Amino acid sequence: GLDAVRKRPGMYIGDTDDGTGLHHMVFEVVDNAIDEALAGHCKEIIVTIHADNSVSVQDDGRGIPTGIHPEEGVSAAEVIMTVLGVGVSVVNALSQKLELVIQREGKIHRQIYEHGVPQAPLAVTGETEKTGTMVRFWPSLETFTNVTEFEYEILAKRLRELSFLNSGVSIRLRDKRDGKEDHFHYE
Ligand SMILES: CCNC(=O)Nc1cc(Nc2ccc(OC)cc2)c(C(=O)Nc2cccnc2)cn1
Numbered sequence: 768g769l770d771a772v773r774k775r776p777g778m779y780i781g782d783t784d785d786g787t788g789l790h791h792m793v794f795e796v797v798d799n800a801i802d803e804a805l806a807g808h809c810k811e812i813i814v815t816i817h818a819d820n821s822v823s824v825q826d827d828g829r830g831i832p833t834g835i836h837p838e839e840g841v842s843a844a845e846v847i848m849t850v851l852g853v854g855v856s857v858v859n860a861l862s863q864k865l866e867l868v869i870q871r872e873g874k875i876h877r878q879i880y881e882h883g884v885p886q887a888p889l890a891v892t893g894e895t896e897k898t899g900t901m902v903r904f905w906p907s908l909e910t911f912t913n914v915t916e917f918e919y920e921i922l923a924k925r926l927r928e929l930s931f932l933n934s935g936v937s938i939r940l941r942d943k944r945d946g947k948e949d950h951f952h953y954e
Contacts, residue, residue: 768851769883772860776910779857786914789906790921792858796824796902797938799855801929803828804936809899811937814926816917818943821864823903830871831900833889842889844869844878849885855902859883861911862904870895882907919947927951 772779780788780795793814803809809828816822832843844867848859859865860883867889869876875893879886908915919942926938930951937952 769849769856769860772851772857773882773910776861779853780861783910784912784914786911786918786921788861789911789914789917790925791853792861792904792906793822793824793917793922794925795853795855795858796822796904797926797929798852800824800826800828800900801933801936803900804933809936811939813939813941814922816919816922816940816942816944817903819905820916821903821905822917823901825899825901827897827899830869830898831867833869833871833874833876840888842878844876844889845885848878848880849883856883858902858904861907863907863909865902865904868892868901868903870897870899870901923949 776783781791782788797812800809800812803826809826811827813825831847835842848867849856859880863881865880867878873894874891875895876889877892878889923940926940930936930938931953934953940949
């Protein structure tokens with residue numbers, strides 16, 4: 768399943784060699800935050816281009832479900848991230864690393880994956896007065912070629928579009944490599 772996506776990344780994510788696929792990975796993650804906004808629960812999304820070749824998407828919604836199936840021992844979060852608008856489990860499969868942090872019901876929950884494989888169970892890392900979901904991922908360098916770094920203007924252009932197609936949601940884009948910041952929101 769996650770092996771199929773790794774074998775033929777182009778089918779799922781788009782071209783792996785000119786940066787189209789690389790940027791679609793961001794948009795896949797954002798679409799879920801936008802859905803949480805369409806359901807009324809998320810007011811703001813923050814997309815950050817980090818200086819270590821990762822992007823993070825943070826929403827202020829209800830947070831991804833964190834409960835465990837008792838007999839299976841697997842959290843809803845882990846199901847969401849590992850099982851097959853191509854979906855976030857594809858992003859996970861094509862990331863050398865992905866970090867999920869969930870603020871929900873007063874607790875911070877966290878899980879790390881490498882190439883889609885979880886490294887430990889979902890775990891509580893603190894308390895919080897907020898809710899939301901944060902996904903931060905480092906794209907796989909076995910998968911992506913030529914364009915292996917995120918490009919501000921490709922995300923800016925698309926995140927503006929999404930801002931105006933889903934009127935009311937605030938989308939912020941931040942680039943840690945040069946301090947560039949933008950704010951997209953339409954009345
Ligand atoms: C940075 C990316 N943001 C993000 O993933 N936000 C998000 C996603 C949520 N659910 C979800 C729904 C569908 C999905 O795959 C298409 C993956 C996750 C949910 C969600 O369904 N939360 C929820 C709803 C009802 C009860 N308990 C938790 C909330 N926020």
